[PDB]
Amino acid sequence: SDVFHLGLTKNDLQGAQLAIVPGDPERVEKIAALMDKPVKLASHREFTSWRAELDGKAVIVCSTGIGGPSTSIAVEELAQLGIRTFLRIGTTGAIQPHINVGDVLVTTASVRLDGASLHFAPMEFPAVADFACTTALVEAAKSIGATTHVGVTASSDTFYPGQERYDTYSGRVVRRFKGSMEEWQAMGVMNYEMESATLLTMCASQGLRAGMVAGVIVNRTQQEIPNAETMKQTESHAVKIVVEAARRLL
Amino acid sequence: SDVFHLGLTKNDLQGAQLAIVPGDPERVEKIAALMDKPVKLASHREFTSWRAELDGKAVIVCSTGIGGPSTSIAVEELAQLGIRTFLRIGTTGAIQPHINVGDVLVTTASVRLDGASLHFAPMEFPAVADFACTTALVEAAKSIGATTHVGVTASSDTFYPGQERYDTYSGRVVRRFKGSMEEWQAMGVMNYEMESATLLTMCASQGLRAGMVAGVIVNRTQQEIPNETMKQTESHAVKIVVEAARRLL
Amino acid sequence: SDVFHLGLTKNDLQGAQLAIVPGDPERVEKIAALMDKPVKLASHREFTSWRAELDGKAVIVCSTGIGGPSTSIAVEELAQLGIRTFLRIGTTGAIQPHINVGDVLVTTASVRLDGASLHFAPMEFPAVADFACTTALVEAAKSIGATTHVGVTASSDTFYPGQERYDTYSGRVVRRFKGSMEEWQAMGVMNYEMESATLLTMCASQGLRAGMVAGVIVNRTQQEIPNEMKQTESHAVKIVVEAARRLL
Amino acid sequence: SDVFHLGLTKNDLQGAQLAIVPGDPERVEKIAALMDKPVKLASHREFTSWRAELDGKAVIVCSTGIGGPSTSIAVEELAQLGIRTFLRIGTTGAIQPHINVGDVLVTTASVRLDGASLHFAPMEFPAVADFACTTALVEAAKSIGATTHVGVTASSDTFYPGQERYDTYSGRVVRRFKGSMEEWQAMGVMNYEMESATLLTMCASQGLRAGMVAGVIVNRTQQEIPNAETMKQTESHAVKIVVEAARRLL
Amino acid sequence: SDVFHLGLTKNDLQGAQLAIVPGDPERVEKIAALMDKPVKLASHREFTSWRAELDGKAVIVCSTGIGGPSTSIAVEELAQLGIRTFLRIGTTGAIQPHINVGDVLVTTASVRLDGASLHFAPMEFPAVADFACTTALVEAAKSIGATTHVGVTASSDTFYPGQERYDTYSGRVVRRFKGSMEEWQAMGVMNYEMESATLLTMCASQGLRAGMVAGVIVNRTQQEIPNAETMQTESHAVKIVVEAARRLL
Amino acid sequence: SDVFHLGLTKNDLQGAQLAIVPGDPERVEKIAALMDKPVKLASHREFTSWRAELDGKAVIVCSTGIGGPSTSIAVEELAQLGIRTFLRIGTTGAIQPHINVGDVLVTTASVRLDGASLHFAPMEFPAVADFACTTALVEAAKSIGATTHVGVTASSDTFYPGQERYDTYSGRVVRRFKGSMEEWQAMGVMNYEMESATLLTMCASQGLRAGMVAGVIVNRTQQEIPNETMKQTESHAVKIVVEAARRLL
Ligand SMILES: O=c1cc[nH]c(=O)[nH]1
Ligand SMILES: O=c1cc[nH]c(=O)[nH]1
Ligand SMILES: O=c1cc[nH]c(=O)[nH]1
Ligand SMILES: O=c1cc[nH]c(=O)[nH]1
Ligand SMILES: O=c1cc[nH]c(=O)[nH]1
């Protein structure tokens, strides 16, 4: 193997320079299945990688696991392998009242509430998306007619206290994050997720292009935990546009 | 008049919802000269304001002065008067070897080396431009014709030590900024300016739209102090910001 | 079905109080197999979970994935289900010339080079392991007679720049971490790993007991590539299982 | 010109080593009018400069514009031109109930609510005024006849949120500055202005002497809002004092 | 004299490698009295030293005074003279209701609410006790049948605001420490003291072994006042720290 | 008796409003011996107190001990008993080549290299001396013909690493303080001491007046062997602080 964690060689990518990167390893197959000639490559830890084709050119689907650390491994080793463009597709909790579950959110930049981003650039540096990648994602969403919101995302290193969840074992939230939800909301932040900050920072500061899109699974102005179903075709809207966006970026 | 610093009433804007915000008060007139019905409004401190017309729509040109603090004043007070879209036209110093004098740089987001941005959002918040504003700016660059680069800019509260300039009185730079320029360069940061961090942070965190464009007047990998410049380079970037404004009405 | 990520219930745990938390989903089965009545419970994302028994007492084995974010989810949801004791068993890179590959490292407290720990307590709070858990781990290592070092661990949010690696895509390390490995060496830090700061902080801040043990797979000073990590892993797997036995 | 922004040459200074540095470019002439043989030198951007004579010695008056960034350029470039001593005359908002409109305030040191000071010294460094300059201003105030208070100032990078003003477009103040005015009030801080922290730090950390005086145009604990008396007697009062102070620093 | 403050030489230690380090200089003798051949060494400022023998080996007892800055001088200059193990014995105020007077507290690690800590290691570094030292203290505590609590201690640079006391001159607490006791209580912190964060951090980062035991004098949450005497518990913690020293020689 | 640590009552102060605050307990009597009706008050820990008289007004002399934590206790409890003005007299190490052994340094404000100051005010707040106290001290120093320097001083929570001394057990200094002395020198910082940051911050932020004067006992740039020099230098500063106190009653 050419890399330590993913168990891949450069030949496995077959010249691919773009990668679609979900959090869940179990979604890699699902996304590769929407493209031509899907071929499984490897599965190690939380890193499941598939190869596929789009307009005759090769593309990589590869999971990152939850959080910046595992993402930082995935992106780095993938980049050592020849990928220059990364498109994250994820699930998200919306913090604005008008955003409906199922909607697609395109991230221009992220509130760095993580730790891995600091390992690539100091906090002054913006966790900003690539312009071509964001453009491709916005245009893809329009040519599909999906309810799309585009703006700032709060990217947290936890699922619970960092996203101000109170339905927990302790039931408390550290000072830093007490009332932080209503603050991001007043600041026009759309949503919470867990990988965009580190992904966006590490790419923007290393000459790599990155885009970020997610489907809403819960609205946090209403509840902390969703009940709604997951595996049908509802959040496939975000998946369809990330594949369509990948087309334009080849 | 309705606001503390700008000497303007809400009636002065005539329904205007977009402002173009140059740093230099003397360039306000030049920008207005490229639009229909340019009328001088007010001149107070570093805040020179003109009103104009684009395609039957009112537009404001108002200077901000150098730096986030006076920038934060102009924007706030222009927002109180009804402005919701801000386009900054400035001058800049390229950090990358491949970016030449005359080039047009559009800012997607900026490195926050300012203090005023902290007065609207904590440091983890991105100093990010509005997507529609950036789009129009990039699209306007194609229209006018310009060698254009798009990306991250370092927005400094100082012209000298924050941009690691050594042509100074002291000849020294504080620890935080020792070797900082070639660190920004390695991170792909394209230029140094002085207002974008404040403008972008304050707008994006307050539901206002903002965009940033600038003409390069010096390349730092070869010189510190800039050295014909504005005569054509300013007019160039100005034509772009005006064209971008058309697309945002 | 109760907890959102793990897909587990109170009942699946069978009144278990202790959980062993490796980073690798593949190591979960291996650890549970060393105990009595091993039974798979669930597998979602990077969280694969098993139940087993030590001396008639139910014990959970649940992976965390790589990093503090995924660790934090696992520990939290396990706590909702009744787990009060957490034992991490991991792999690590030694940064002291006298700690070679195959050695066992017990962490007293961690250098907090993560982000998730700050979501539970401010940086001034120590990322410290529970005393009973640490005691159990040291004693179990002596019981099998392993080469054991006890001390502080640098817990990084990245495998590469945070642990000061230059053999990368860009080859650069941000100012904060430039020369940092020499600093940790000078300060007597034993090793780099990627989950302890989050685990130890969130547990010490919430009334949970936690201990950290790791087998050395690489030494950051030496010029040597892995030889049987497999020998080291199953070795440390015995220590953590034997430690859990004392904590029930 | 010898400098990039200011449009001034060393000859323009005529051997001057003292600068009076108001915020407002329109005040430059007013200040120079209290001295002998005032002549306009230059006007560029926010930087309007005048030369005048005080007790036979050459003295520069030069505007800084609002904020630390503008101040940092002016002071740097004046220093390049030969200036060693800087006197700030400004307007301010008093925050203590006992300090009235029309009072004169001399700053010994400032709370650094700016970003430009960090470009000259870390936060732990004091934004402290030079002893001689401060002495000259205390004596001048007493020589002119004024109600004078001496102490700590809050130097903010914003007029609004950093000074906890709420009647704004957004109506909100960022966490950092929520209840901040009440805290500074409890800490004995007497006023808000916008350039002392930058000026005091960059001078004290570079062997330059700096002084800070301001006239109270508003009190944040009172409902009464003056006048024309803002730019009126109060402004004129402080201007007389700064000129009188300059006489003792030649 | 070999060192700047303590007024001691290498010879004065007689090959001692362990030091017991109380806060109060008045307590140094009492501790040394429990051991063989107690002899005063020196007394300068807040640092009063005594030498004793324990099971044949030489042992130093030396005061640090109040706070990290003085502690860092004692520990530094003692280390220069050949001291490798440091054991802190003090008195403390419990912040947890279940902790009563007469209870002993062993500190595994400390909350770094001090300043001197940062002069040895960045805030990221844990203010952690040495394992052998901690084990020894818990064993020695158990061997005298003491009610022992093991865990995290909050180490403050101040007695008043950093421990969130309002019964003061100003009656105010700075933002940082406003509501901070409730937070530490929720996080399971046992008590406040003023010297551990410095001792633990500087030792754990320089290859020196450190540990801390403390007797509870008062409780910040309990109504009941200490009896005919406060400090019965005083002599126990001293006996504990002396007994722990034995296992570490 | 009215306080927890100092062992004083308001009655002991006899309506005193100014205190002189050295670090060393032994200097307390010496400062008092230059005034009228000097009398011992109390001695607990590193807090030795004396009351004297000057022009019919009671004056307190009280030791703080080494460091901010110790100082914060003394200053707080003195303030509870009625002291409003605090004058610190100390020994110091100059870092400027132009500052010589035996020179007299008056502190306008201090670099906050401490932790205790943060317990009273956030880092943005200046550790500044009161103007009247600074004036009195400068005015007092010229009256007896001292060679005087008036400026900023670095106030460190450690004697060693924070003042960037390398002749230590470990021989190392944290990144934060590597090359820090050279940077303070370039910034115009006069000297190193260990109490002013805490004293000045807590006084300036609580409506208390404070100042500091010190005498130079070592220069960190050259090898001037410390000769009686400490004796004569201390005597001159002690005279200065008492003469300054006279002007503040
Ligand atoms: O609420 C949510 C949903 C998905 N991912 C998150 O981080 N938060
Ligand atoms: O170099 C430059 C040029 C213009 N503006 C800046 O801020 N820097
Ligand atoms: O070097 C290593 C080996 C394992 N895990 C790490 O985090 N680093
Ligand atoms: O409130 C005020 C008044 C004048 N200047 C300021 O900076 N603030
Ligand atoms: O160098 C010195 C001398 C005296 N006091 C200090 O703190 N440092």
CSV table of N, CA and C and ligand atoms in Angstrom, one decimal, chain B residues 66 88 90-94 154-156 158-160 163 165 191-195 215-220 223-226 230, chain D residues 4-5 45 73, ligand 2:
chain,number,residue,atom,x,y,z
B,66,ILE,N,-9.2,54.2,5.8
B,66,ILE,CA,-8.3,53.0,6.0
B,66,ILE,C,-8.7,52.3,7.3
B,88,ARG,N,-16.7,46.4,-1.8
B,88,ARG,CA,-15.5,47.2,-1.6
B,88,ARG,C,-14.6,47.1,-2.8
B,90,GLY,N,-10.8,48.3,-3.6
B,90,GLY,CA,-9.6,48.8,-3.0
B,90,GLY,C,-8.3,48.6,-3.8
B,91,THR,N,-7.2,48.8,-3.1
B,91,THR,CA,-5.8,48.6,-3.7
B,91,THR,C,-5.1,47.5,-2.8
B,92,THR,N,-4.2,46.8,-3.4
B,92,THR,CA,-3.7,45.6,-2.7
B,92,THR,C,-2.2,45.3,-3.1
B,93,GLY,N,-1.6,44.5,-2.2
B,93,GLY,CA,-0.2,44.0,-2.5
B,93,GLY,C,-0.2,42.5,-2.6
B,94,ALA,N,0.2,42.0,-3.8
B,94,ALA,CA,0.2,40.6,-4.0
B,94,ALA,C,1.3,39.9,-3.2
B,154,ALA,N,-5.2,38.3,3.1
B,154,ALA,CA,-4.9,38.6,4.5
B,154,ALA,C,-5.2,40.1,4.8
B,155,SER,N,-6.1,40.3,5.7
B,155,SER,CA,-6.6,41.6,6.0
B,155,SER,C,-6.0,42.2,7.3
B,156,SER,N,-5.1,43.1,7.2
B,156,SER,CA,-4.3,43.6,8.3
B,156,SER,C,-4.7,44.9,8.9
B,158,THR,N,-2.6,46.8,10.2
B,158,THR,CA,-1.5,47.8,9.9
B,158,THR,C,-1.0,47.6,8.5
B,159,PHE,N,-0.6,48.7,7.9
B,159,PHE,CA,0.1,48.7,6.6
B,159,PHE,C,1.5,48.1,6.7
B,160,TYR,N,2.1,48.2,7.8
B,160,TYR,CA,3.5,47.9,8.0
B,160,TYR,C,3.8,46.6,8.7
B,163,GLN,N,1.8,43.4,7.7
B,163,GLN,CA,2.1,43.0,6.3
B,163,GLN,C,3.6,42.6,6.2
B,165,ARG,N,6.3,44.4,6.7
B,165,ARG,CA,7.1,45.4,6.1
B,165,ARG,C,8.3,45.8,7.0
B,191,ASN,N,-3.0,38.0,-1.4
B,191,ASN,CA,-2.7,39.4,-1.2
B,191,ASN,C,-2.9,40.0,0.2
B,192,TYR,N,-2.4,41.2,0.4
B,192,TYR,CA,-2.6,41.9,1.7
B,192,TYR,C,-3.5,43.1,1.4
B,193,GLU,N,-4.5,43.3,2.2
B,193,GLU,CA,-5.2,44.6,2.3
B,193,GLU,C,-5.7,44.9,3.8
B,194,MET,N,-6.5,45.9,4.0
B,194,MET,CA,-6.8,46.4,5.3
B,194,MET,C,-8.2,46.6,5.8
B,195,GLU,N,-9.2,46.2,4.9
B,195,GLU,CA,-10.6,46.4,5.3
B,195,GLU,C,-11.5,45.1,5.2
B,215,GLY,N,-7.4,46.0,-7.0
B,215,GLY,CA,-6.4,46.1,-8.0
B,215,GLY,C,-5.0,46.0,-7.4
B,216,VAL,N,-4.1,45.2,-7.9
B,216,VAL,CA,-2.8,45.0,-7.3
B,216,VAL,C,-1.9,46.2,-7.7
B,217,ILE,N,-1.2,46.8,-6.8
B,217,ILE,CA,-0.4,47.9,-7.0
B,217,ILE,C,1.1,47.7,-6.7
B,218,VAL,N,1.4,46.5,-6.1
B,218,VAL,CA,2.7,46.1,-5.8
B,218,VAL,C,2.8,44.5,-5.6
B,219,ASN,N,3.9,43.9,-5.9
B,219,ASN,CA,4.1,42.5,-5.7
B,219,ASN,C,5.2,42.4,-4.6
B,220,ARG,N,4.8,41.8,-3.5
B,220,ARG,CA,5.7,41.8,-2.3
B,220,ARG,C,6.9,41.0,-2.4
B,223,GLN,N,9.1,43.7,-4.3
B,223,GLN,CA,9.2,45.0,-3.6
B,223,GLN,C,8.2,45.3,-2.5
B,224,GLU,N,8.6,46.2,-1.6
B,224,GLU,CA,7.7,46.6,-0.5
B,224,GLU,C,6.8,47.8,-0.7
B,225,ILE,N,7.5,48.9,-1.3
B,225,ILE,CA,6.7,50.2,-1.5
B,225,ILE,C,6.3,50.3,-3.0
B,226,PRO,N,5.1,50.5,-3.3
B,226,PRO,CA,4.6,50.7,-4.6
B,226,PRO,C,5.0,51.9,-5.4
B,230,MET,N,-2.2,53.6,-9.9
B,230,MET,CA,-3.7,53.9,-9.9
B,230,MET,C,-4.2,54.4,-11.2
D,4,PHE,N,4.8,57.3,2.0
D,4,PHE,CA,3.9,56.7,1.1
D,4,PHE,C,2.4,57.3,1.1
D,5,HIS,N,1.9,57.5,2.4
D,5,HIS,CA,0.5,58.0,2.5
D,5,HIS,C,0.4,59.5,2.8
D,45,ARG,N,-6.2,61.4,1.6
D,45,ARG,CA,-7.1,60.5,2.3
D,45,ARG,C,-7.7,61.1,3.6
D,73,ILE,N,-0.5,54.2,10.6
D,73,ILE,CA,0.1,54.7,9.4
D,73,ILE,C,0.7,56.1,9.6
G,2,LIG,O1,0.8,46.7,-0.1
G,2,LIG,C1,-0.4,47.2,0.1
G,2,LIG,C2,-1.0,47.9,-0.9
G,2,LIG,C3,-2.3,48.4,-0.7
G,2,LIG,N1,-2.9,48.2,0.5
G,2,LIG,C4,-2.3,47.5,1.5
G,2,LIG,O2,-2.9,47.2,2.5
G,2,LIG,N2,-1.0,47.0,1.3
